[PDB]
Amino acid sequence: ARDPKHDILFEPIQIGPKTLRNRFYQVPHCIGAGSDKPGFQSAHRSVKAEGGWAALNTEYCSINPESDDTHRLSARIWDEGDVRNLKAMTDEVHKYGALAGVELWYGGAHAPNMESRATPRGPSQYASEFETLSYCKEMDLSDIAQVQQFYVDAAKRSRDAGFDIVYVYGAHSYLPLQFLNPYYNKRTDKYGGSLENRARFWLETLEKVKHAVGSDCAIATRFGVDTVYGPGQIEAEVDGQKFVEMADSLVDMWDITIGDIAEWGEDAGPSRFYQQGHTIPWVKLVKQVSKKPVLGVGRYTDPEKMIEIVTKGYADIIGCARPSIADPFLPQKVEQGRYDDIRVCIGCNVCISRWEIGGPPMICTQNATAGEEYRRGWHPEKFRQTKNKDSVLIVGAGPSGSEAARVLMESGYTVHLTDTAEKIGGHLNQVAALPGLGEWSYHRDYRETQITKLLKKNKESQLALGQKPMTADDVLQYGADKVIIATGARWNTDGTNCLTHDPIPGADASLPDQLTPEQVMDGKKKIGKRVVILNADTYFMAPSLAEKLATAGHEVTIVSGVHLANYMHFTLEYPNMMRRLHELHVEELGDHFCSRIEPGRMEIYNIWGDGSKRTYRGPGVSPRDANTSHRWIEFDSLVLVTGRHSECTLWNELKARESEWAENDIKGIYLIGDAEAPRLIADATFTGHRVAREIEEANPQIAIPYKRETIAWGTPHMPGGNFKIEYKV
Ligand X SMILES: Nc1ncnc2c1ncn2[C@@H]1O[C@H](COP(=O)(O)OP(=O)(O)O)[C@@H](O)[C@H]1O
Ligand Y SMILES: Cc1cc2nc3c(=O)[nH]c(=O)nc-3n(C[C@H](O)[C@H](O)[C@H](O)COP(=O)(O)O)c2cc1C
Active site residues: 174
Looking at 165, 218, 362, 648, which residue binds ligand Y (CB under 6 A)?
Answer: 362
> Quick one: 11 or 697, whose CB is closer to a second copy?
697
Task: Tell me the C-alpha distance between 198 and 239, whole Å.
Answer: 10
Q: At what angle do helices 38-50 and 80-95 cross, to 10 degrees?
A: 20
> Quick one: 114 or 421, whose CB is closer to ligand X?
421
Any contact of residue 366 with ligand X (CB under 6 A)? no
Task: Tell me the C-alpha distance between 15 and 17, whole Å.
Answer: 6
Task: Tell me the C-alpha distance between 56 and 86, whole Å.
Answer: 13
Give which of 569, 582, 580 is closest to 264, Cα–Cα: 569
Any contact of residue 399 with ligand X (CB under 6 A)? yes
Any contact of residue 345 with ligand SF4 (CB under 6 A)? yes
Any contact of residue 439 with ligand Y (CB under 6 A)? no
Smallest gap from Cβ 321 to ligand Y, in A, equals: 3
Judged by CB under 6 A, which stretch of 293-301, 425-433, 548-556, 690-698 contacts ligand Y?
293-301
Long-range pairs, 34-37, Cβ under 8 A, ≥24: 34/58, 34/59, 34/61, 34/73, 34/74, 34/75, 34/76, 35/61, 35/75, 35/76, 35/77, 35/81, 35/82, 35/85, 35/86, 36/73, 36/85, 36/709, 37/361, 37/374, 37/709
Partner touching 384 among a second copy, ligand Y, ligand SF4, none, CB below 5 to 8 Å by kind: a second copy
Q: List the interface residues with ligand SF4, window 265-324 (CB under 6 A).
A: 322
- DSSP notation for 521-586: HHT-S---SEEEEEE---SSHHHHHHHHHHHTT-EEEEEESS-TTTHHHHHT-HHHHHHHHHHTT-
Report whether 541 belongs to an annotated binding site.
no
Report whether 419 belongs to an annotated binding site.
yes
Report whether 211 belongs to an annotated binding site.
no
Smallest gap from Cβ 448 to ligand X, in A, equals: 13
Report whether 103 belongs to an annotated binding site.
yes
> Quick one: 213 or 691, whose CB is closer to a second copy?
691
Report whether 348 belongs to an annotated binding site.
yes
Residues that contact ligand SF4, how many (by CB under 6 A): 13
Any contact of residue 322 with ligand Y (CB under 6 A)? yes
Task: Tell me the C-alpha distance between 240 and 259, whole Å.
Answer: 12
Report whether 314 belongs to an annotated binding site.
no
Query: What backbone torsions phi and psi does residue 81 show, to the nearest 5 degrees?
Result: -65, -35
Task: Tell me the C-alpha distance between 85 and 96, whole Å.
Answer: 19
Report whether 470 belongs to an annotated binding site.
yes
Looking at 244, 346, 532, 586, which residue binds ligand SF4 (CB under 6 A)?
Answer: 346
Any contact of residue 366 with ligand SF4 (CB under 6 A)? yes
Task: Tell me the C-alpha distance between 169 and 202, whole Å.
Answer: 10
Q: Strands (DSSP E) along 111-202, which ranges?
A: 121-122, 137-138, 165-170
Task: Tell me the C-alpha distance between 584 and 560, whole Å.
Answer: 18
Any contact of residue 348 with ligand SF4 (CB under 6 A)? yes
Looking at 504, 650, 669, 671, which residue binds ligand X (CB under 6 A)?
Answer: 650
Judged by CB under 6 A, which stretch of 181-189, 340-348, 456-464, 720-728 contacts ligand SF4?
340-348
Smallest gap from Cβ 413 to a second copy, in A, equals: 16
Report whether 345 belongs to an annotated binding site.
yes
* Partners of 668 in the β-ladder: 482
Give which of 100, 111, 30 is closest to 64, Cα–Cα: 111
Q: Are 31 and 42 in contact (CB under 8 A)?
A: no
Smallest gap from Cβ 17 to ligand Y, in A, equals: 23
Task: Tell me the C-alpha distance between 724 and 716, whole Å.
Answer: 9
Task: Tell me the C-alpha distance between 166 and 152, whole Å.
Answer: 11
> Quick one: 369 or 487, whose CB is closer to ligand SF4?
369
Task: Tell me the C-alpha distance between 497 and 697, whole Å.
Answer: 36
Report whether 420 belongs to an annotated binding site.
yes
Smallest gap from Cβ 477 to ligand X, in A, equals: 15
Query: What backbone torsions phi and psi does residue 217 show, to the nearest 5 degrees?
Result: -125, 155
Looking at 40, 60, 378, 570, which residue binds ligand Y (CB under 6 A)?
Answer: 60
Query: What backbone torsions phi and psi does residue 224 show, to the nearest 5 degrees?
Result: -80, 90
Partner touching 59 among ligand SF4, a second copy, ligand Y, none, CB below 5 to 8 Å by kind: ligand Y
Any contact of residue 30 with ligand Y (CB under 6 A)? yes
Report whether 218 belongs to an annotated binding site.
no
Q: Strands (DSSP E) along 369-503, which ranges?
A: 391-395, 414-418, 462-464, 482-485, 489-491
Q: Are 24 and 331 in contact (CB under 8 A)?
A: yes
Give which of 275, 269, 206 is closest to 243, Cα–Cα: 206
Q: List the interface residues with ligand X, window 678-717 (CB under 6 A).
A: 684
* Partners of 596 in the β-ladder: 603
505 DSSP assignment: T
Report whether 159 belongs to an annotated binding site.
no
Q: Are 275 and 243 in contact (CB under 8 A)?
A: no
Any contact of residue 486 with ligand X (CB under 6 A)? yes
Smallest gap from Cβ 43 to ligand SF4, in A, equals: 16
> Quick one: 120 or 176, whose CB is closer to a second copy?
120
Smallest gap from Cβ 444 to ligand SF4, in A, equals: 13
Q: List the interface residues with ligand X, window 210-249 (CB under 6 A).
A: none
Report whether 321 belongs to an annotated binding site.
yes
185 DSSP assignment: -
Any contact of residue 273 with ligand Y (CB under 6 A)? no
Report whether 17 belongs to an annotated binding site.
no
Looking at 326, 432, 451, 562, which residue binds ligand SF4 (CB under 6 A)?
Answer: 326
Judged by CB under 6 A, which stretch of 38-46, 378-386, 420-428, 598-606 contacts ligand X?
420-428
Task: Tell me the C-alpha distance between 577 and 544, whole Å.
Answer: 9
* Partners of 593 in the β-ladder: 605
Any contact of residue 351 with ligand Y (CB under 6 A)? yes
Residues that contact ligand X, how many (by CB under 6 A): 26
Report whether 478 belongs to an annotated binding site.
no
Looking at 364, 407, 602, 640, which residue binds ligand SF4 (CB under 6 A)?
Answer: 364
Q: Are 393 and 484 in contact (CB under 8 A)?
A: yes
Task: Tell me the C-alpha distance between 63 and 66, whole Å.
Answer: 8
Partner touching 718 among ligand X, ligand Y, a second copy, none, CB below 5 to 8 Å by kind: a second copy
Q: Reduce the DSSP state of residue 40 to 3 states and report it.
A: helix
Any contact of residue 334 with ligand Y (CB under 6 A)? no
In which element (H, E) is residue 401 found? helix 399-410
Any contact of residue 330 with ligand X (CB under 6 A)? no
Helical H segments across 622-704, by residue range? 649-656, 659-663, 681-693
Partner touching 60 among ligand Y, a second copy, ligand SF4, none, CB below 5 to 8 Å by kind: ligand Y
Any contact of residue 214 with ligand SF4 (CB under 6 A)? no
Judged by CB under 6 A, which stretch of 149-157, 286-294, 483-491, 692-700 contacts ligand X?
483-491
Contacting positions for ligand SF4 (CB under 6 A) = 322, 325-326, 345-351, 364-366
Binding residues for ligand X, rule: CB under 6 A, are 395-401, 418-421, 426-428, 469-470, 486-489, 647, 650, 673-675, 684
Task: Please give the annotated binding residues, written as ranges.
Answer: 28, 30, 60, 103, 169-172, 222, 267, 299, 321-322, 345, 348, 351, 364, 400, 419-420, 427, 470, 674
Residue ranges of the binding site for [4Fe-4S] cluster: 345, 348, 351, 364
Binding positions for ADP: 400, 419-420, 427, 470, 674
Q: Which residues bind ligand Y (CB under 6 A)?
A: 27-30, 59-60, 103, 171, 222, 257, 267-268, 297-299, 320-323, 351-352, 355, 362
